Amino acid sequence: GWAESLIGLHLGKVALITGGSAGIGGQIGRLLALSGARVMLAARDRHKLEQMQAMIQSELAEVGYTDVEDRVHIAPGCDVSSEAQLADLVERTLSAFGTVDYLINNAGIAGVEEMVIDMPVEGWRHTLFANLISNYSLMRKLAPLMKKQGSGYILNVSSYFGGEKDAAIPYPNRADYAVSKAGQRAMAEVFARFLGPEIQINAIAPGPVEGDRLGLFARRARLILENKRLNELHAALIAAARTDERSMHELVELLLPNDVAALEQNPAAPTALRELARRFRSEGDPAASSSSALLNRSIAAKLLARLHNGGYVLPADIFANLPNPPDPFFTRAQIDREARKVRDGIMGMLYLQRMPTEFDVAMATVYYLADRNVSGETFHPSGGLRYERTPTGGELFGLPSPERLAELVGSTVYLIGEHLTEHLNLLARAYLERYGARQVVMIVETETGAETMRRLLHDHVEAGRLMTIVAGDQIEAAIDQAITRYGRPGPVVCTPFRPLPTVPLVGRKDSDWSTVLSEAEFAELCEHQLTHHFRVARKIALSDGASLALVTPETTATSTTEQFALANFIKTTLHAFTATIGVESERTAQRILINQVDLTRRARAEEPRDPHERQQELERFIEAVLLVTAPLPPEADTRYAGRIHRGRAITV
């Protein structure tokens, strides 16, 4: 009865739905089948997938379809993070049904669920493989057949937290997930012109749905409280260490009695730690041992990891004798209070004051799939949400205040890059010659890049003002070398080592697509243009850098059209990272200012066309980098100014 609108809507279509055993994906597969499509449901777990297949087949028979076993197939054991398994899934689907009409890129994992500074690099990479690279990989395998037959549809199941065309949505503690969701949207935005007219590509971006948060909530609330304690201790130690003569080792030794009141009362402890202990005693529940003990062994291990990953020298056994605080570390009251805060916060987003169901979101999506006139769009099948957003793409700016520029005198600057040699030369010379920096550490990828920069900067090399380090694929170890030999950085500028590739993004209708950007090449693009910046941001924040500008690839008036597309894919996707880590840093009292400077524009017509305009552009680049990297003087770092100067992106 409720399905009469659906029956026939997609008759004759073949759909592949990843993550099709449950959630939105299972409902999309169910409703597509009811609408008349033959569906392949892919998932990890065989049992749930068999149950979903049986449910759908039974419903099809109830409404009158025959031979229902021919209309719903399953592909169990399918881990979309594995390229080999994606190849197997496509072969299985084409063997069952022939050419796929609709690719529903629905599979997604939650990811690492940590702040960037607690996020293992391999965990970030895994999230990108599962949630983003898999979407390109399946498109790359199925679009040739779609184009050959003259029609197809790619739908990437993104999220409200993937942002929108000209604004990022910060998702603290979920930067890997947010980047993956933004990339799914950006893929549709930039590939639409290449895939048209035969193939539509769009994203859906539902907000919260009933069930997407899957005792467990009490456990997550406790982790929230444990990570707040970690953040407060870490920020106080980092702050104390930069203005105290004692080493980080000696500062951590002040925590070893694990006694809040004793630390507060210790007249020789740094003010930052004494004030923190006072807050723990005041803001803490008297029945919670966290009000009288500084940490537990779990927090201590995670804190030690942060310190080691920031290059601070401490024995691995420093916390081996830490007194264990008695249970409960946080009270049930504190934990339930935090859990209600999380829940009420989500429900408070909803203008309509009602949580959408997976079924309703899937229904809206199945209707939307009938629309043949949309491509490159993000459809919100549920929406109406109060949430913070960070507009991107401001182009009108000037230099920072003289007060901020004065903070650069005597500073240690790190510049990271290789292919943008002109930009790196101009930046090093600006910091050293105009703004009185003490030294620039130039961190390149290869010996050839190092020699190129040493020759361009020969005068500063000879004077001891320009040091070079060759990082290869070990940027964190290279930063550690810089810390040990030249000192911790103030301002840092991170440019990509590699240029963008110049291969086709789609193939001709009758071709084998052999020259089109491969699945491995797309993964390499993400490594060099997204993971590069994440690794630097993670390491620099852990190492107490004062500021960090993340710089995207350069487009010019002569860049190929494919370079424009990939550059804008990267620009939009990186905005999600910048906005998220900016808010993470702000909310955890980290002083680092992280922002993005875009050398990519949306349209060739905006680019400089003669040497004068090119000189104007390069001057704008220097001004933009100074605007985001000049530290805030003490008389200026208010809550108000702090929000302004983090998480933003400006376009040169």
Add this chain to the structure above:
Amino acid sequence: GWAESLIGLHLGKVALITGGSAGIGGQIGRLLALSGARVMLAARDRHKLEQMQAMIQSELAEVGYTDVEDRVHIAPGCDVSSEAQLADLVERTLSAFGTVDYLINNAGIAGVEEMVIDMPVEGWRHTLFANLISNYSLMRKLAPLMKKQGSGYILNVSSYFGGEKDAAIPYPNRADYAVSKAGQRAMAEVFARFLGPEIQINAIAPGPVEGDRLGLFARRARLILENKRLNELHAALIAAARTDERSMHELVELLLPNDVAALEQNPAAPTALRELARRFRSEGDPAASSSSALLNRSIAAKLLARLHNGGYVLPADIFANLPNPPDPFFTRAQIDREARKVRDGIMGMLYLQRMPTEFDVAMATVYYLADRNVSGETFHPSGGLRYERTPTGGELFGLPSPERLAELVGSTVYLIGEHLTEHLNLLARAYLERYGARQVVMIVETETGAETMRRLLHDHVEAGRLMTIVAGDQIEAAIDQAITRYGRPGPVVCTPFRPLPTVPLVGRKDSDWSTVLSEAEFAELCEHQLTHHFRVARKIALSDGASLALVTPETTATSTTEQFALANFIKTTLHAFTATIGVESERTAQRILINQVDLTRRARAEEPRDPHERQQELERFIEAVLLVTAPLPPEADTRYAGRIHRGRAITV
């Protein structure tokens, strides 16, 4: 057969569709009726509306409905620009069907179809009444009954050229239309939280559709060529007049022989006019009289209007004896070439390389209306478009270059405002005391505002550096007084005379809504917060101002929640104006830089909370205004820099 998906989808609903006799609106009414809703179709023309009603009723009977005359009613003679007629339409609809479930705000006019500087003020107002104020008016009449019954839906039919959440889409020669379309979207964005949970409000924003451009196209191409000639002559005269000792009257006298070659060869004519004549001879078709004659009587009249509206003194009969050039002024080849350019440009926007039909857009909309989980959204039922966009809402900026600030020494500044007395005081003092302006003309609304500013600025008043003018509702005449008495302006800052109202935006479920923002109050809001800026921008551009900052209302940490909503409605809607007039100016070689400085933020949490942060905010305001109003020195106004410095909005 194609309608089986539709039958029953909206059974039991009552829908009011304005502009329902043709176009998308007629198809939405048709498909809603087929889906089971009872529909009231409102339109101007009785005959087309009767034909549409008969078509739909016949189709309903074919699919099995009975008593079809009870399911499709019409309201002819309905001009949505008239508040009295909107009241009549609601009474007629409620009398026919009872409470309306779906309000489809579809009626729209194309508007004035002129550049801002050729746009009559009453024509702009009429477009806002027809396209935007009418949408609020019908919502204000129907939402009380929707809320009382516990459910309703408001759908505003906007356009791709209304922009999106954080980006404006410039629509040159259509600024009134674009503003009206952006306002329709912004209404949904800001009212959603107040109308929830009972009422959904969304916009649709289709792109080009088959038929929306309605021999006529050849006529529009000719107007394009005539307005290009107008723009080129006007820009050259304005430019010549600012650096030539002769009056505008004497400069126009050089055009009276109407002889292109003679003007080019006149050694005493200003270089700007001689170079223009050379271009007319070179770029012109030899068979077109526009290659040998400067203008015709139609262009001359429109040029004289621009000059008079900019305060230049010329006899009304100056062109009475202009030699009439022989036909054709532009050749058929030139006209057809321009027409193909327009057509191919539109078709070239489409990723899918196919023009959507009204039926297909309506079908997508009728499916979308079934979704109960979206509010405050803009759905694109067709899309996939290459078009320029202008991101809004950058917050990270600094002062302009010292080279630009030097252009302010000796300048004549106009400041327009009344309620923002602190901002006006700080601005006048910045220009006079820090940047060496010669004089500030303070243009206020009332004598009380004038006296307030004279007292705040007493020292500069006594010194002859601050002049006050009282404008009332005659801002153009006030600017003319300033031009005559104090000289033409360089930088201009336009702030609103009036604050935002503090009335409720929705009523309680069981109330009569008597205190809720009235239809007249909404029209007044548009007059004071949108039309105010349009009138100033039109007049200042015609009067050769060097730059213009349009300033939106101020939100603070203590603004009411309704003030935040209305302020953000205004901010988003004005972005469409700023972006459009910025591109109009750029593309027609006008030197004026027009940009927007926003004193409104999206969220209370971003606002300053103490006197230090408030001081930081006010300093940011001054910096933002200087960044957009300091003129570009001669060594800087390239095509590249010119695009950057026009049409942008920055958030303080």
